[PDB]
């Protein structure tokens, strides 16, 4: 399983 | 931008035996960026419907791909892999040598 999406906003670079 | 030219190996999945079905492989690796053109050639002519692996990369970030197709080696038929990449001025042709 890949890293799940975080609770809030997925942080861009 | 820094770019890396592909390494190319052409070889068979199984030890080559004339008249016996096998897979011809062209493994391109160590290249960057990821766009790359790879043809497998039978007697200088592009083989149709060649499959390839999903784009992945090594710990040093360079990409690698396996291109492959079923073939039945004969004594007379010549096979090769033809590769183009931004790092290459012209397509590079690597001949299949059943001992390499």
């Amino acid at each position: 399983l890949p890293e799940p999406l975080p609770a809030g906003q997925l942080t861009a670079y | 931008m820094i770019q890396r030219t592909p390494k190319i190996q052409v070889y068979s999945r199984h030890p080559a035996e004339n008249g016996k079905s096998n897979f011809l492989n062209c493994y391109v690796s160590g290249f960057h960026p990821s766009d790359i053109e790879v043809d497998l050639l039978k007697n200088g002519e592009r083989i149709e419907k060649v499959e390839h692996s999903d784009l992945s990369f090594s710990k040093d970030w360079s990409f690698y791909l396996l291109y492959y197709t079923e073939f039945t080696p004969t004594e007379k038929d010549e096979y090769a892999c033809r590769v183009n990449h931004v790092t290459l001025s012209q397509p590079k042709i690597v001949k299949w040598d059943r001992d390499m």
Partner: protein, 276 residues
């Protein structure tokens, strides 16, 4: 033995040719088991190993959501990095991420990895502590600060110590017949004269899994590192790998050369000579 899981993300911009492509592939050791490609006619997470197919729709949809969202975020990231490097809108660029967890032979977390690159150069990496970052340059420092502010490392750590290890162990069990099976190399030594006074000895290793292997030539018991031609380990396409190592030796000295083969699958390390 030890095992690892890795996901490899590649996000490629292509100005004038649509939005950046995002591809993700997942591996357990040297076995790919999943792919996602934003350029697919219908982008979705697809199985690439038989032992993953048993996962239910919930799994596939979960993956697909993750990859679809990442696709969008990486497009943002590509825009951001283009800015961090004051780059023109004209050029193509690539962000790569590799991440995952390593287990020791006891199945315990050895360490996590989470590394990113831009245009093939290290960009930012999660340190082994899974808590701090190493940024390659002042551009990556912007990402570092942004990730520090968003407590991103905590997210990565939670995954790497948690779901990463838990799912890796699951895959290892489900695919134990292959994932936990080391196939030893089939080996032989070939001999080809190159001239009247020299010949090539080539030591072959075929059909081995995993790819990790050591193939060396010794002359009179001494390593011939500089004189050995060693091709990159290469996939056969049947899960197994191949490698050879070649040395050119004086004719009549062939028996002074030994090929040594180390591989997880070998009950004992091998020592081969040319057998006329």
């Amino acid at each position: 033995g030890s095992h690892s899981m890795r996901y490899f993300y590649t996000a490629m911009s292509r100005p004038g040719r649509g939005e950046p492509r995002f591809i993700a592939v997942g591996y357990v050791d040297d076995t790919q088991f999943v792919r996602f490609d934003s350029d697919a006619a219908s982008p979705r997470t697809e199985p690439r190993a038989p032992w993953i197919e048993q996962e239910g729709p919930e799994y596939w949809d979960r993956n697909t959501q993750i990859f679809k969202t990442n696709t969008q975020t990486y497009r943002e990231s590509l825009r951001n990095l283009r800015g961090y490097y004051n780059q023109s809108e004209a050029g193509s660029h690539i962000i790569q991420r590799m991440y995952g967890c390593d287990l020791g032979p006891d199945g315990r977390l050895l360490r996590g990895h989470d590394q990113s690159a831009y245009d093939g150069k290290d960009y930012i990496a999660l340190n082994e502590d899974l808590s701090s970052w190493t940024a390659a340059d002042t551009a990556a420092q912007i990402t570092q600060r942004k990730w520090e502010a968003a407590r991103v490392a905590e997210q990565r750590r939670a995954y790497l110590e948690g779901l990463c290890v838990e799912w890796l162990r699951r895959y290892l069990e489900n695919g134990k017949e292959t994932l936990q099976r080391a196939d030893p190399p089939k080996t032989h030594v070939t001999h080809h004269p190159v001239s009247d006074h020299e010949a090539t000895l080539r030591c072959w290793a075929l059909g081995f899994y995993p790819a990790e292997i050591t193939l060396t030539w010794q002359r009179d018991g001494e390593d011939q590192t500089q004189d050995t031609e060693l091709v990159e380990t290469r996939p056969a396409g049947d899960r197994t790998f191949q490698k050879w190592a070649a040395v050119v030796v004086p004719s009549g000295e062939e028996q002074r050369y030994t090929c040594h083969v180390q591989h997880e699958g070998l009950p004992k390390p091998l020592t081969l000579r040319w057998e006329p």
